[PDB]
Amino acid sequence: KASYPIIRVKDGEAETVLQFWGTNEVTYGMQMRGTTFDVNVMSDLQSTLAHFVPITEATTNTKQILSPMPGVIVAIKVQPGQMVVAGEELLTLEAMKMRNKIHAQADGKVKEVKVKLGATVEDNEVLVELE
Amino acid sequence: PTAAEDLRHKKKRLTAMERVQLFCDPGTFRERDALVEHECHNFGMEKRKVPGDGFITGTGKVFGRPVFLFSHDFTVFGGSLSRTNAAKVVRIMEEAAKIGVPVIGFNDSGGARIHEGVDSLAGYADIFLRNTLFSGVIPQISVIMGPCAGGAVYSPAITDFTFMVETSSYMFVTGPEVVSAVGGKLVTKDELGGPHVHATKSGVSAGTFPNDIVAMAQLRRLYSYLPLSNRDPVPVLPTADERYRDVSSLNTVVPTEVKEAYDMRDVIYPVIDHDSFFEIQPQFAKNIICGFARVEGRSVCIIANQPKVQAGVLDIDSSVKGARMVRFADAFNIPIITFVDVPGFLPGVQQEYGGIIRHGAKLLYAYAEATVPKVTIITRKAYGGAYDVMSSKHLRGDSNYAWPHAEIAVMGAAGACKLLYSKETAEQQAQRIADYEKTFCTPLSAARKGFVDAVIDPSETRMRVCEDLERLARKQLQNPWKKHGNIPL
Amino acid sequence: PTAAEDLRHKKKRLTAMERVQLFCDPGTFRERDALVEHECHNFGMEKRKVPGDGFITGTGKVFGRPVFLFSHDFTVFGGSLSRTNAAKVVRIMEEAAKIGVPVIGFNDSGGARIHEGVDSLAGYADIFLRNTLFSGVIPQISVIMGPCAGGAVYSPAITDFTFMVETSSYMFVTGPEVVSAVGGKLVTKDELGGPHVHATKSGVSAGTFPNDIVAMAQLRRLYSYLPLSNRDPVPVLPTADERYRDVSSLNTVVPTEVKEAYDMRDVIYPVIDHDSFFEIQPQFAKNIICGFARVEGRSVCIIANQPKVQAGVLDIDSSVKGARMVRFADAFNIPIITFVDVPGFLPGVQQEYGGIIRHGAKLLYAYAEATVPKVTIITRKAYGGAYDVMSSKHLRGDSNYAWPHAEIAVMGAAGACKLLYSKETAEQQAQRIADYEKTFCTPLSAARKGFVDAVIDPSETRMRVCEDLERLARKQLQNPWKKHGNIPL
Ligand SMILES: O=CCCCC[C@@H]1SC[C@@H]2NC(=O)N[C@@H]21
Ligand SMILES: O=CCCCC[C@@H]1SC[C@@H]2NC(=O)N[C@@H]21
């Protein structure tokens, strides 16, 4: 069914079930045996032209993380100078009656000095420094 | 045979003809004019005539529906315009004005052609006038694949949507040489007018793509949404999705605490059909979301706040973004669906020093002037003038709905308690703010006054939206006679 | 009998009724509604009913021509709006929509009335919708005599012109208490939204007056210019001045050096009739002048650059100012006269970081969309896209004129010489820049192409303008059918 997950396919006797995650019209996100892949489905022109396309490399920066917006820090989660893993919440600012929660996108460890509780300073300061 | 394009591809770049071939259907492009020369006769230009004269204009066909397009050529004279280049574009736009067909242009010009004198200015003026006259008649989309400098930048600006390519494109009015000459600062071309700058800082570019191939692939998808002309109806496509699909996950999206945040996409995605959202300006003014989507196989317009970013507070940039989206959607008879969650306007001196009064009025003007069917859903809160601006029932709204835990009040409980009791006995906070929030920060009063049609379970939103949007298919409303409005610029 | 107004005058302030009496004719005001109560029945408001309910609405008559007006009252409840106050204003605006009459309002409200709940929001929404619908049908003028805070600020914004009183008026969206609460900065009310701030920084206020008496006296003079409605013709008044008055002082205004500055008012004043200029926004974006004036007894619109300030360079603020003026002038069929002297656009990073591309397109859109008769005079220079924007002949201009020492070129001589000779032998400056400026920085080439009708002596400008404006009295031009445009916001 269009835009749905389950996809039942049966060649001869063999039967398989795959899943359809999403796409950007050149790359298809399909699941095979409980694993995500990205298959490219392109015609003759797109195939012959995709060779002549720049492939830039994104910035790989392991450095200090700053608070996007002003606020107040009410709760902290991580400890100064210990291990940090991707997807871990680090602290929570509260602004105009709203607690956000900036986390650690991706890294192994940190070296820094924690901003103490109730420090209504923010203004894009260095709350946690990753080194 | 791959002649004369090896020099181009060696620089990791594509050609105009290749871009045109990628955009349209496999074999449905008919180039209109191909043997035209510049006839300049100045500054040693009497030689080196070119057959195509740096432009490729044709008709093409996308998804079985007609289109018109033109593409600049960087190899020939740097893509400069002339008295002769602009004639082809003018002819294409005039033909696409007679017939109800849109126009899409891939800009690559390096600037004006100096060897023609003021004829380049003449051509620019003609193109500007055609864009001005035909805006609101046929949709216009522009993509910038390479450099775009000088006064040629203005014609993409008048167009409805402008997209940018990441690595090898930029746009600005004046070059960095003049900036160094007058101010004395050394800034590179990318640092001045790169795609990121216009994606985040200036708000001109409506999107950014990583490659030309992806740009074409998604431009086709965007084109699948648009109506063909001003008088043609909104397209409807077949779809296996149905209004009876169960959405009970909406009962739990809103947290029971009033100070916790949530993602509005968790409310947007269930209501619309699967994998049918095309966000517009995703990296600019993130506190508001705008884009296109389909509901039961017909394209609609989506405008919702987001408490994830800055508590979902209206601002200057958000106001401009929403105003432009609403104006375009209404110009071509596209239904509008809005989700409301706003505590007010962003407070700060910089805001008044930047003219919040002008900018915030644009969204209100766009919402009030609109005559397309509107549907509004109030999830959690709506305070002060923000409630009025975001498509309130009094602005000729068709149907308005609220969720059982909503709040519609003049302002927060603290300010109301302060103003209602000047020098009342101390500790008044505890036994007054709670009571006032209990009694008047609830949708019961607004429902008593008649400002919301009904209070609904969050699981019935898809059913209600499909029903209302099906019933409202044939509304005919007209404004008083005017030559045109006077919007607060 | 001077009862109950002694308390008001003691604070060096006037009353609403006194302001109304000063505005209209001596005995031609007929108050419409005077015995109306709030019927609230909440928070101990069942008592202290007021007969007028804080508003004075009537009809009046100015210079023998009808008008409609309303005035807030600060003594009664602080001027707060309600479900009942807004009804009178809605009735007045609806009546002034049926009949071709304008509306003028003197705002003094302290904010919304909390004791009514969401009914104040309902009234605000109704007033906003009426302003949105009737903008471009009848002219709307607003004057702010006292405090104006909260969401009530938006209705003056949609109105065509907003004026301010110096000592005792201010306007902003959010009070300084909230600013202190969130940001922590202590700013006074005047430092936040005083008349100077909106006169110079935000660009919202169209003027400032020293006293209420002077405000009324000059508001009458402004009203003498406007047409009564959308369909009524431009007013023409008797005048002893004649087109045959000698103006030979224009032969010497332009200095013979290209780097010396002059005042454009020395060119503006001789052409128009004596003592008939009403500048709009005099203290904001001084590099451009906009206002109203009379030519042979009929009101026209004036838009001219000024090389006195910043070399007469177009900018963001100037673009917004000119765009709003042109849009208003065209909406009501008022002729436009422009004087051109521009070297280009202002170069700087802040400009691109602030969106020059969006703002500079607004003036071009306003000039191209307009259908009223246009007259353009190029005094000294016009370069690049600035020449295109400032009402060039290709944008359906009626008549264009130039002065004998004008210059119309693609860009300055230095840049052209640089681009036309990449690595040409050194010292090329002396024998190339002079030659290029001599050969192509002159109106002869632009006249050969046909972009200026004729090259005239500066002493004939009044004669030519009067002749053309008399002949063009009955032009009928129409744009293609649209629900409305899509201007770059
Ligand atoms: O209570 C003090 C600060 C409350 C601010 C509440 C939000 S912040 C921006 C917006 N402006 C307001 O007046 N309220 C909201
Ligand atoms: O020759 C170097 C500086 C020339 C600037 C000339 C004026 S300044 C602003 C405007 N922008 C230009 O490109 N030219 C004019």
Residue numbers in the entry:
A (entry chain V): 535 to 665
B (entry chain C), C (entry chain H): 34 to 522
Quote the study that presented this structure, word for word.
Here, we report three structures of endogenous LtPCC: an α6β6 dodecamer, α5β6 undecamer, and α4β6 decamer. To sort out LtPCCs with missing α-subunits, we performed symmetry-relaxed 3D classification and determined two additional LtPCC structures: α5β6 undecamer, α4β6 decamer. The α5β6 undecamer lacks one α-subunit, and the α4β6 decamer lacks two α-subunits on opposite sides of the LtPCC complex. In our decamer, undecamer, and dodecamer, the conformation of individual subunits is preserved. In other words, the structures of these complexes differ from one another only in the number and positioning of α-subunits. We utilize the α5β6 and α4β6 architectures of PCC to demonstrate that PCC oligomeric isomers differ only in the number of α-subunits. For each oligomeric isomer, the α-β binding site is either occupied or unoccupied. In other oligomeric isomers, at least one active site cannot participate in catalysis, and so all non-dodecameric PCCs are less catalytically active than the dodecamer. We found that most endogenous LtPCCs exist as α6β6, and in descending frequency, LtPCC also exhibit oligomeric isoforms with the oligomeric formulae α5β6, α4β6, α3β6, α2β6, α1β6, and α0β6.
